[PDB]
Homo-oligomer: A and B are copies of this chain.
Amino acid sequence: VDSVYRTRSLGVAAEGLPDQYADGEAARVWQLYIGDTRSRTAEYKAWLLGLLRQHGCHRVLDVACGTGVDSIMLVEEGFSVMSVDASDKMLKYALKERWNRRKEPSFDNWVIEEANWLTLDKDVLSGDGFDAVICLGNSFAHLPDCKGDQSEHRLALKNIASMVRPGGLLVIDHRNYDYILSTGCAPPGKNIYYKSDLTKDITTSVLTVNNKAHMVTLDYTVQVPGTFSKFRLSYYPHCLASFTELVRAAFGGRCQHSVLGDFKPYKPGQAYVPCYFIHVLKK
């Protein structure tokens, strides 16, 4: 009968060998994708920097660090920044950049550390709080609704919020999923933070469980240096109404709150329809 004689546990590593699935086909192309950071839109640079300085922010927490491109931007512009993520595969790249730039003193004092949203309160010693916590580039939408009620969303958000000082900023965004769901397609290469130097082809799959949007799964088909490869990633489709509710509730109502358009303000029922929705609040 049927059990699977594994050669090594899932999740272990040996010294000679490449990890688990690290050099398959799909991982290969996915690196190309996470690496098509690196020509940051001036639009974005100007806004984020504008905002942080207009609110007198200095101590920053980037909670969906990734390869750290946004943190690097802050770390260069003289902010003092702590960056965390739960992905080793991505923090790899932020740590590698810091080390490369280790002689620059601003980068010597860049702190990169491990952290999970569901335990952020005991993973990051908040202290009294950060002047600004950021979570951009649609990363919150990675966190799936595994237990049905959006209970893990609600806990991720309260915690992220718990990192903010009184009179501080949380800047957290998400892609326009109101658009995506009503269209059924998630358009390629409209990233507003980083212009994609990478021509890449997208198939949108929406899963709807009992009349409730539950997952948007994207299969990216990227073309490879001179040599077509595929990889897949999934998102929770946060609608604007819901998320507003969710994030506001995370502060227990005692917040301010504005919803940004694509970087400029958002009036409900606008002529222009944004690609991303940015939420900025103050505790």
Contact = CB atoms under 8 A, between A and B. Distances in A.
Interface in A1-30: 1-24, 26-27, 30
Interface in A38-96: 64-66, 85-90, 92, 95-96
Nearest to A203: B210
Interface in A73-127: 85-90, 92, 95-96, 98-99, 102, 108, 116-117
B205 A184 contact: no
Contact of A139 (B4, B9, B14): B14
A88 B15 CA distance: 9
A86 B15 contact: yes
By size class, the interface of chain A is 35 or more
A205 B207 contact: yes
A201 to B, nearest CB: 11
A198 interface: no
B12 A144 contact: no
Given A88-B89, A89-B88, A205-B214, A1 B15 contact: no
Contact of A7 (B5, B21, B108): B5
Interface of A: 1-24, 26-27, 30, 34, 64-66, 85-90, 92, 95-96, 98-99, 102, 108, 116-117, 137, 139-140, 142-144, 146, 156, 183-185, 203-211, 214-215, 217, 230-234
21 contacts: A1-B8, A1-B17, A9-B232, A11-B22, A11-B23, A11-B27, A11-B30, A12-B231, A12-B233, A13-B87, A13-B89, A14-B234, A16-B139, A18-B86, A19-B86, A20-B20, A22-B88, A95-B96, A184-B210, A204-B211, A206-B208
